[PDB]
Amino acid sequence: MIITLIAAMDKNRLIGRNNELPWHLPADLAHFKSITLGKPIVMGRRTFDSIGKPLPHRRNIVITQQKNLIIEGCDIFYSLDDALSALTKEPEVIIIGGARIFKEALPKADKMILTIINHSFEGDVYFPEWNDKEWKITSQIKHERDNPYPFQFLELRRLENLYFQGHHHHH
Ligand SMILES: NC(=O)C1=CN([C@@H]2O[C@H](COP(=O)(O)OP(=O)(O)OC[C@H]3O[C@@H](n4cnc5c(N)ncnc54)[C@H](OP(=O)(O)O)[C@@H]3O)[C@@H](O)[C@H]2O)C=CC1
Ligand SMILES: COc1cc(Cc2cnc(N)nc2N)cc(OC)c1OC
Numbered sequence: 001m002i003i004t005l006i007a008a009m010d011k012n013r014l015i016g017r018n019n020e021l022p023w024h025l026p027a028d029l030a031h032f033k034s035i036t037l038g039k040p041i042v043m044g045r046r047t048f049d050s051i052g053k054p055l056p057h058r059r060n061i062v063i064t065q066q067k068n069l070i071i072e073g074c075d076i077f078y079s080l081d082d083a084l085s086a087l088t089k090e091p092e093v094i095i096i097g098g099a100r101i102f103k104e105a106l107p108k109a110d111k112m113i114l115t116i117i118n119h120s121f122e123g124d125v126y127f128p129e130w131n132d133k134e135w136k137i138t139s140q141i142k143h144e145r146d147n148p149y150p151f152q153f154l155e156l157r158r159l160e161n162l163y164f165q166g167h168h169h170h171h
Pocket of ligand 2: 006007008019020021028029032047050051095096097114115
């Protein structure tokens with residue numbers, strides 16, 4: 001199973017304000033949808049509440065501690081680990097937020113697909129700081145504003161150590 005975090009953030013890693021997105025960025029919404037269709041998506045309960053309904057054409061998984069919580073059109077699990085355990089056969093599970101889920105998922109994540117907006121918004125929740133020594137950039141695409149803020153799509157893949165790593169060429 002590949003664990004992938006997808007998130008949109010500003011230059012300070014801000015992702016949210018009052019349980020809403022701090023911006024409207026159509027390019028990001030198109031990107032997110034095209035990436036997530038036909039994959040299982042995992043979100044925390046507040047993010048589901050923010051979205052307000054299941055995202056169509058995808059398996060919506062919601063994490064909550066509330067044992068008797070019912071959400072039509074979503075699968076409920078009582079921990080991220082329980083969800084990941086149930087999805088063992090999936091080639092890729094996409095974690096879609098929010099801040100609490102991202103923080104918990106990051107130590108298990110293999111991949112990150114990040115939209116980074118070149119602007120500073122006002123807000124209350126952030127994407128977790130990742131260790132730049134642990135991850136390599138596999139794709140970076142910068143976009144000028146039109147989408148009224150400039151933005152980039154940055155893809156990262158988790159590494160494996162210079163001391164122990166294999167090498168591409170040998171004499
Ligand atoms: N910019 C972006 O890409 C994104 C932004 N957002 C933003 O993030 C914010 C929401 O994030 P946040 O408030 O952190 O909430 P989350 O979306 O991470 O949901 C938190 C809730 O999820 C449940 N939960 C999380 N982890 C566990 C666990 N390990 N075991 C059991 N239950 C768990 C709990 O539900 P319960 O209370 O029911 O027990 C908890 O209150 C919003 O502002 C939203 O707009 C969200 C996604 C992406
Ligand atoms: C498709 O609509 C929404 C999607 C998301 C999650 C999300 C959106 N974009 C990116 N790049 N990563 C994510 N995890 C979060 C939302 O609100 C918190 C949405 O409602 C506007």
